[PDB]
Amino acid sequence: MEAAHSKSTEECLAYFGVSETTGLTPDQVKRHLEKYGHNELPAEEGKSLWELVIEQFEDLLVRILLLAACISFVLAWFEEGEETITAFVEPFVILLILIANAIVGVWQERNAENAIEALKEYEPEMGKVYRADRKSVQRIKARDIVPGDIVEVAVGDKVPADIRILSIKSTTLRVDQSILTGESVSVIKHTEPVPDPRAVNQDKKNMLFSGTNIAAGKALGIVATTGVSTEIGKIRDQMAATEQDKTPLQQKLDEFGEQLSKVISLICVAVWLINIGHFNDPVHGGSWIRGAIYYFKIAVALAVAAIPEGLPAVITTCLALGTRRMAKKNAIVRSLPSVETLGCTSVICSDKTGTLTTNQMSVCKMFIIDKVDGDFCSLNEFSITGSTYAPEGEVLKNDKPIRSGQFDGLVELATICALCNDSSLDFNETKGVYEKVGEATETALTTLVEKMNVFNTEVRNLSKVERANACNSVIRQLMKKEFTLEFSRDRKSMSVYCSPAKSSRAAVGNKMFVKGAPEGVIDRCNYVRVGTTRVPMTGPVKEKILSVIKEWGTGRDTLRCLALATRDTPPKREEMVLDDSSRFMEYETDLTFVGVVGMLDPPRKEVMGSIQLCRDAGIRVIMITGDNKGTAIAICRRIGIFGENEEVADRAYTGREFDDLPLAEQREACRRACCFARVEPSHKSKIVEYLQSYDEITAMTGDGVNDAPALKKAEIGIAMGSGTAVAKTASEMVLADDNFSTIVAAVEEGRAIYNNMKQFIRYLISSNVGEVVCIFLTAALGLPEALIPVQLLWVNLVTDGLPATALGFNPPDLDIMDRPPRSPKEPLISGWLFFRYMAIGGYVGAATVGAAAWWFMYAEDGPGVTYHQLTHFMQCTEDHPHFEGLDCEIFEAPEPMTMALSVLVTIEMCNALNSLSENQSLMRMPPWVNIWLLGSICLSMSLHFLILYVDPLPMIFKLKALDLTQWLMVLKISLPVIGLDEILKFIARNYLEG
Ligand code: NA
Numbered sequence: 001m002e003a004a005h006s007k008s009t010e011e012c013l014a015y016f017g018v019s020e021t022t023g024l025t026p027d028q029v030k031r032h033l034e035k036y037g038h039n040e041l042p043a044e045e046g047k048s049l050w051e052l053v054i055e056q057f058e059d060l061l062v063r064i065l066l067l068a069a070c071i072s073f074v075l076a077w078f079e080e081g082e083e084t085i086t087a088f089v090e091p092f093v094i095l096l097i098l099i100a101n102a103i104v105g106v107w108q109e110r111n112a113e114n115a116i117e118a119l120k121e122y123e124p125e126m127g128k129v130y131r132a133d134r135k136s137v138q139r140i141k142a143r144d145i146v147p148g149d150i151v152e153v154a155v156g157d158k159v160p161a162d163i164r165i166l167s168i169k170s171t172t173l174r175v176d177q178s179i180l181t182g183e184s185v186s187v188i189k190h191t192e193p194v195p196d197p198r199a200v201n202q203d204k205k206n207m208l209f210s211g212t213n214i215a216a217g218k219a220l221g222i223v224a225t226t227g228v229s230t231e232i233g234k235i236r237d238q239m240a241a242t243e244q245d246k247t248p249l250q251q252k253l254d255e256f257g258e259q260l261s262k263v264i265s266l267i268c269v270a271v272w273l274i275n276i277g278h279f280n281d282p283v284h285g286g287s288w289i290r291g292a293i294y295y296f297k298i299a300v301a302l303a304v305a306a307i308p309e310g311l312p313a314v315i316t317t318c319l320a321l322g323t324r325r326m327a328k329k330n331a332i333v334r335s336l337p338s339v340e341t342l343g344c345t346s347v348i349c350s351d352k353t354g355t356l357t358t359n360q361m362s363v364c365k366m367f368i369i370d371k372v373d374g375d376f377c378s379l380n381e382f383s384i385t386g387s388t389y390a391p392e393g394e395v396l397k398n399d400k401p402i403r404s405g406q407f408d409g410l411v412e413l414a415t416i417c418a419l420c421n422d423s424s425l426d427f428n429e430t431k432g433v434y435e436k437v438g439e440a441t442e443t444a445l446t447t448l449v450e451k452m453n454v455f456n457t458e459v460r461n462l463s464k465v466e467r468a469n470a471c472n473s474v475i476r477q478l479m480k481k482e483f484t485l486e487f488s489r490d491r492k493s494m495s496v497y498c499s500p501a502k503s504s505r506a507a508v509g510n511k512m513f514v515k516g517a518p519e520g521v522i523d524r525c526n527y528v529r530v531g532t533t534r535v536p537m538t539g540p541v542k543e544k545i546l547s548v549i550k551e552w553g554t555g556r557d558t559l560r561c562l563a564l565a566t567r568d569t570p571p572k573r574e575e576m577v578l579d580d581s582s583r584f585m586e587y588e589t590d591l592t593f594v595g596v597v598g599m600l601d602p603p604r605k606e607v608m609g610s611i612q613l614c615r616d617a618g619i620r621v622i623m624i625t626g627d628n629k630g631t632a633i634a635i636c637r638r639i640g641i642f643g644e645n646e647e648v649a650d651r652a653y654t655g656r657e658f659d660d661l662p663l664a665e666q667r668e669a670c671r672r673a674c675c676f677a678r679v680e681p682s683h684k685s686k687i688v689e690y691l692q693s694y695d696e697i698t699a700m701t702g703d704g705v706n707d708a709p710a711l712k713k714a715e716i717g718i719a720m721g722s723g724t725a726v727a728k729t730a731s732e733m734v735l736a737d738d739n740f741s742t743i744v745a746a747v748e749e750g751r752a753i754y755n756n757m758k759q760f761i762r763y764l765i766s767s768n769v770g771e772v773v774c775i776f777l778t779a780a781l782g783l784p785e786a787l788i789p790v791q792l793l794w795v796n797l798v799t800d801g802l803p804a805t806a807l808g809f810n811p812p813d814l815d816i817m818d819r820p821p822r823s824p825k826e827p828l829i830s831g832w833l834f835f836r837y838m839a840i841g842g843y844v845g846a847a848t849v850g851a852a853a854w855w856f857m858y859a860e861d862g863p864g865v866t867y868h869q870l871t872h873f874m875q876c877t878e879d880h881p882h883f884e885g886l887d888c889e890i891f892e893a894p895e896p897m898t899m900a901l902s903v904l905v906t907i908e909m910c911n912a913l914n915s916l917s918e919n920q921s922l923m924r925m926p927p928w929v930n931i932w933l934l935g936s937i938c939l940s941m942s943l944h945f946l947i948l949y950v951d952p953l954p955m956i957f958k959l960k961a962l963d964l965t966q967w968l969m970v971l972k973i974s975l976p977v978i979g980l981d982e983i984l985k986f987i988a989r990n991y992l993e994g
Contacts, residue, residue, distance in 0.1 A: 001015055001145060001164075002164075002225065002229070002892045003197050004207065004225075005164065005194045005199060005207050007193055009165075009166045009193075009542065011231060012164045012166075012222050012224065013166075013222065016148035017148075018149075018222065018843050019132070019150075020166055020167070020222075022130055022131075022132040023130035023131045023149065023150035024129075024132065024146070024149055025127060025131070026132070028148065029146065033144075034229065035950075036147050037226075037227055038143045038227065039142055039143045039161055039227055040226075041145045041227065041228060042228065044117055044246065049974075051238075052106050052109055052777060053104075056102035057098070057102065057954070060257045060258060061247060061257055061761055062098060062499075063929070064264065064303050064307065066303060068303040068789075069094040069098070069660070071093050071296050071300050072091035072094060072789070073088075074296075074510050075091075075226065075293065075296060076091050085300065085955075086955060089956055090789050093790055094304070095791070097793070097797075107360070108167060111198060113729055114711060115239060115708060115711075115729040116239055116240055116728060118234070118235050118726045118729040118730075119726060120180065120230060120730075121726070122210075122726075123160075123210070124139065125162050126141060127141075127142040127151060127153060128153070128157075129150060129151050129152070129947045130150040131150075131153075131326050132603055137431045137761060138362070141556055142161070145160055145223060146223065146226060147223050147224065147225060147226055147495075148222065149221060149222075150220065150222055151221055152215060152217040152218075152219070152220055153218070153219055154215050154219075155217065155461040155682065156336055157214065158211065158213050159175075159208045159213070159214070159985060161210045161224075162207065162209055162224050162231060163210075164206065164222050165190070165191050165221040165222070166190065166654050168189070168191060168220075169217075169220060170177050170216070170217060170218040170323075170737075172217055173188065173189045173215070173217035174186040174187065174216035175208060175294070176215045178724075179383050179704055179724055180201060180232065180400065181210065181766045182703070182706070185438065186249070186661055187205075187508040189578070189649060190205050190579060192206060192486070193206065199594065200681050201681065204491070206961050208223070210232055211229070211230045211629070212231040216898045228461050233290070235705055235706065239730070241832040242709065242712045242713055247338070247340050248341065248344060248824040249337070249340045249754075250337055256738060256765075256828070260306060260307070263306070264306050265304055265694025266303065266785070267772065268299055268302065270776075271295065271439070271776070271779055274776075276480065286544060286877075288597075298785075301594075301775050301788060302775050302776075304793060305493065305771035305774070306340065306771070307796075308768055308796060309796040309797055310764070310765070310796045310797040310798075310804065312325065312798065312877075313467055314760055314764070314801055314804040315761075316336065317805050318753065318757060318760070319336040319339050319484070319753070319809065322339055322749065322753045322808075323339065323439060329742065329745050330735060330736040330739065331733060331742050332734040332735075333732065333747065334728075334731065334732060334733065334734065335748070338472075338716060339749075339750055339753055341697060341716060341732070341750070342732070342733070342749075343753065343754045343822065344750075344821050344822075344823075345698070345699045345715075345716055345721065345821065346620065346638050346696045346697045346699050347619065347691055347696045347697070347699065347742075348614065348621050348740075349622040349623075349684070349701065349714075350623060351701045351702070351703075352601075352623055352626070352699045353601060353625070354722075354738050355735075355738055355739065355859050356604065356607050356623060356635075356639060357601040358602050358739050359601060360389070360440070361441055361443065361444035361599050361600070361919070362386070362387040362599060363444050363597045363598065364383065364387075364557070365552060366596060366790070367380055367381040367382070367385070367595055367596055367656065368380050368407065368409030368529070368597065369528050369530050369541070369908075370530070372530055372538070372541055372625055377541050379544065379548065380396070382396060382397050383396040384396070384448060387445070387600070388433070389436050389443055389449075390427060390434040390435065390447070390834060391425070391450035391468065391470075392453060395452060400852070401690035403456070404452040404453060405456050406969070408532050408915065409530070409594065409595060410454055410595075411824050412566065412594050412595075413453075413455045413564060413594055413595040414452050414475065414614050416452045416515060416565075416566065416594060417446075417448055417449050417472075417564070418445075419475065419481060419496050419498055419513050420440070420484075420495065420513040420514065420515040421442050421515075422442060423436065423439050423442030423443045423445070423446055423626060424446055424468075424469055424472070425446055425468040425469055426465075429464075431463070431599075439602070442554050442580070444599050447599070448597065449468075450468075450470050451789055452927040454471070454475075455471070455748070457470060472694070475704050477976060478500075479498040479499065479501055480495075480499050481497070481498055482498060482499055482510075483497050483498070483578055483586045485578070485588070486584075487516070488901065491520060491588065492520050493520060493588060494515055494516055495513060495514040495515070495584070496513050497899030498510070498512070510569065512570040512587070513564075513566050513571060514564065514566065514588050514591055515562055515563045516562050518545075518546070518596065519561040521563035521565055521591070522545060522563055524565075525537050525565055525588050525590050526592075526593065527590075527591050527592040528593045529566075529593060529595075537593065539784075544594070545596070548596070549563075552598045553628070553634065554633075555634065556634075556637075556638065557600075558600070558631060558634045558638050559598030560601070561596055561597070562597050562598075564593075566591065566594055566598065569594055570587070571669055572751070603635075603784040607740055607741060608640055608730070609741070613748075614744060616818050617817045617819070617820070617821065618820030622687075623635070623636055623639075623641055623675060623676070624676050624678070624679055625676075625677055626678065627677075628678065629693060632677035633652050634929070636652070636675050642674065642675070648866040650669070650672060651672050652675040653669060653677070654677045654678045655683060658679075667690040667693060669690075670687055684700060684702065684709075688702075689713070695824070697715050697716070697824065698714045698715055698716070699712035699716040699717075699719070699743060700718065701719075701743075701920050702720075702725070702727055703720040703722070703723030703726060703727050705919045708730040710807075715732070716732045716733060717732050717733070718731055718735060718743060719731035720734070720738045721736045721738055722738055727733070735745060744954075748817055749818070750822060751812075751822070752813075753815050754822070755810070755816075756807055756810045758828065759807050759918070760804040760805070760808060761828060762828070762829060762837065762913060762915070763803070763804055763911065764796075764838040765829070766840055766911070767795070767800050767844075768796070769794070769838070769844070769983075770842075770843070770845045770847075770904070771787070771792055771796075771845070772841070773844065774787055774845040774900070775844020775849040776788055776845070777788065777845055777902060780876065781871055782870070782871035783870055783871065784856075784874070784892065786852045786900040787900055787901060787904065788849065788958065791957055793978065794947070795901075795905065800908050801916075802936040802939055803908070803933060803936045803940065804912075804938045806930065806936035807915055807916075807930075809932040810933075811929060815887035840911065840980065840984075843976075843977060843980055844908075844911075844977065847974070848900040848907075849900065851896075851899040851900045851903040851969070852899050852900045854965070854969065854973075855895050855899045856870060856896055856901065859966070861895055861963070862890065862896065865881075870891065874891065876888040894960040895960055895962075897959065898959045898960050898961075898966075901960070902962060902967070903943065903970050903974055904971045905940070906908035906971065906974035909940060909941065910973075910975065910978050911978045912936070912937060913934060914978060914982075915931070916930060916933065923984055924977070924983065947959065949961060
């Protein structure tokens with residue numbers, strides 16, 4: 001029964017055919033259970049370990065590598081010899097990388113928690129029902145509860161289902177609905193029907209929502225809905241129906257995956273079409289087995305040379321490090337891929353209270369009526385200092401300190417603020433400052449009465465803790481509080497019924513003290529107080545009151561106003577039903593206007609600044625607030641969101657206004673809006689949709705289960721440190737301090753990190769290019785293999801991975817926040833950059849072959865066979881050129897490989913320096929700009945020497961220590977790469993910058 005709140009208790013009983021005194025029968029229980037299912041959100045998918053392990057082998061590149069391991073394995077099997085301790089190393093090494101890769105992938109999932117599963121924390125194990133098969137209440141499992149069940153709840157219980165309250169057993173009933181409505185103070189519940197069938201949760205004063213807690217009282221009710229049909233269940237469905245796209249880099253990297261796959265295969269064909277000469281060969285003679293071993297040997301190295309095997313580890317390391325760095329700045333990021341997205345944030349939607357403001361309330365102004373005489377009128381306006389809850393400050397009329405007590409209007413004003421109030425103070429001796437107890441707005445009133453001291457009570461003598469609630473306690477003793485009529489949004493006020501304290505045998509003197517939003521409160525005033533006297537409310541004096549209120553709310557003061565009034569002749573106590581909240585406005589009429597207080601929730605000190613940063617960075621800012629429209633706007637002007645005097649007609653909306661607009665116009669409104677006031681339950685989420693229809697990267701703040709859907713939808717959901725665990729688990733980021741400025745800082749960190757990622761990504765991929773050239777050249781020049789897979793894999797994971805990581809510490813550009821958001825469509829490598837890395841690739845691939853060849857020719861240790869061209873034969877079945885001497889296995893000498901590999905290693909260390917800046921010369925941005933990079937290079941070289949000397953390793957990699965001559969050559973052929981890029985950067989700075 002979805003509409004239970006708008007039905008009478010009798011209609012809900014009738015609908016389900018259930019007896020309030022016996023409850024459902026065992027047949028009803030069965031049937032109901034068959035129709036509605038059990039009371040519980042559905043289980044998460046049964047993602048098994050075996051399935052999880054399988055998923056680690058889905059990516060195109062890991063398939064290639066697996067394939068290449070199989071070929072490597074078959075080759076290290078279908079090969080003759082006795083050296084097995086240096087044969088199966090390769091295929092094993094490739095497999096071990098894939099195992100570690102899959103291991104990590106699995107470790108990630110075991111540690112990942114989804115928000116949908118966090119929802120289940122709010123479903124209690126047990127609940128209490130009345131069923132016809134028993135007399136006394138039975139405590140059954142909450143999943144066994146069904147619509148129609150008569151249920152019982154009491155203080156401390158977690159509501160097991162969405163329930164229509166039938167009967168309140170205790171005096172009142174109080175609920176903690178913080179998790180669903182953001183009302184953090186316990187709300188009072190009733191049993192009368194709520195007329196509007198489209199009432200938002202906050203106004204269903206007769207409902208208990210599954211997952212909430214009874215704060216006080218005992219109640220009996222009937223279950224309206226269970227499972228996915230409850231308020232939180234609908235929230236679960238929205239979240240589950242939300243599909244989350246891959247981050248821009250994830251998408252672009254997946255595109256590179258396909259493309260590189262397609263590239264790898266083409267190069268294999270290219271190596272085929274180059275040997276189509278073998279078709280014109282005698283069928284007899286030559287080795288076919290060895291001919292195929294030749295292709296599969298290069299296909300393996302080719303795949304291995306082309307994959308940036310260490311890239312995923314480098315990225316992760318970088319992101320993890322950045323994350324620790326962001327946490328130091330109060331930004332707790334939860335998902336590593338979010339760090340990139342955060343940098344692209346084009347829109348931030350922020351709640352005002354507690355994020356843009358401090359949520360530390362303070363009364364700054366107040367006024368009473370001074371006199372009314374015909375068309376003439378004067379108010380007494382005052383000021384109050386002190387912006388803490390501490391009772392330290394003073395009242396001032398025209399800056400001159402006055403004494404509240406000398407004004408009677410003020411005695412009463414204070415009596416309302418003190419009596420018509422459910423909050424207090426407390427001096428916390430631990431922190432040594434005054435803290436609130438209750439609501440912000442109410443404690444500010446408590447604070448205000450203490451500064452006012454309307455009865456000049458001896459207060460300075462009292463201790464620190466006793467000082468807290470002294471002037472209040474005084475006012476309390478003056479009036480007995482008989483009862484209170486709670487605040488409702490329909491009337492936007494509250495009242496308290498009070499009788500004189502010293503009273504033996506009397507029935508006259510009773511008062512109601514009314515506090516609330518000025519418009520409705522003032523409309524119900526027929527009288528205006530003037531000291532102790534009273535006069536009729538008149539058209540002119542009304543405008544006077546309203547104009548001041550308007551000025552205070554809509555001006556640079558940005559104050560939240562509250563009207564205070566009293567009912568002099570309140571209805572007789574017996575004539576009032578304290579149960580029908582719909583009668584409260586009626587009991588609050590024929591009032592006397594006493595005064596107005598204006599309070600402030602101050603902007604955080606950093607917000608002004610942070611908002612300006614965004615304007616520089618081309619990031620739009622939208623405030624979502626509970627202020628009315630005028631004040632919403634005024635606060636927006638105040639903080640920088642709006643220009644002080646600029647037009648805003650079409651950039652500010654209330655929920656009402658926004659709902660009235662047709663779908664097209666709502667979408668339109670969202671492109672230009674910077675202020676949403678009084679926003680509905682569904683709005684954040686619809687606002688996010690529209691924003692995404694313009695391809696905005698959207699940040700959205702929230703803190704309750706009811707924000708969870710929007711948090712999940714937006715690309716950067718942002719939760720408050722002080723918020724619910726569910727909102728956190730639904731968000732890309734948590735604000736340790738709740739401060740809007742933390743967001744802007746974390747965006748800046750994201751830009752800085754992405755710029756560096758581009759660098760080490762381009763560095764690594766460019767490294768693969770040269771590796772591929774080296775393999776290809778060797779093949780299409782019939783040379784001895786210059787580099788082998790085990791060597792490549794070492795370079796791609798260790799030798800280059802260190803500098804790649806060090807590149808993540810590249811200093812950030814000063815102009816980072818002075819450029820618009822990066823477009824998600826922006827390609828990683830494109831145009832000039834393709835050429836650069838193509839040329840760089842060329843040179844690296846040539847240098848490595850040439851390093852081997854030079855040893856094979858113009859060097860001593862190896863044959864002085866210049867232009868002999870090892871091209872010709874690699875079979876040795878004719879034995880022509882080297883006539884005298886029985887040697888033919890010098891082709892596999894470890895010296896040439898060691899020349900090539902040391903060239904690669906040395907070049908890439910050099911190219912790591914060329915990677916300090918995309919376009920700036922090493923003349924302008926020197927190597928030492930990044931000490932981590934310098935350190936990294938020393939480490940990688942020490943590691944190269946490690947594999948060169950430490951016995952097991954030089955055999956495994958197939959290497960031999962180099963002569964100072966040979967090393968001195970390695971340098972000669974490596975250092976020029978620096979000159980090459982310097983030239984190319986020069987061409988970019990001077991002949992492209994237009
Ligand atoms: Na999200």
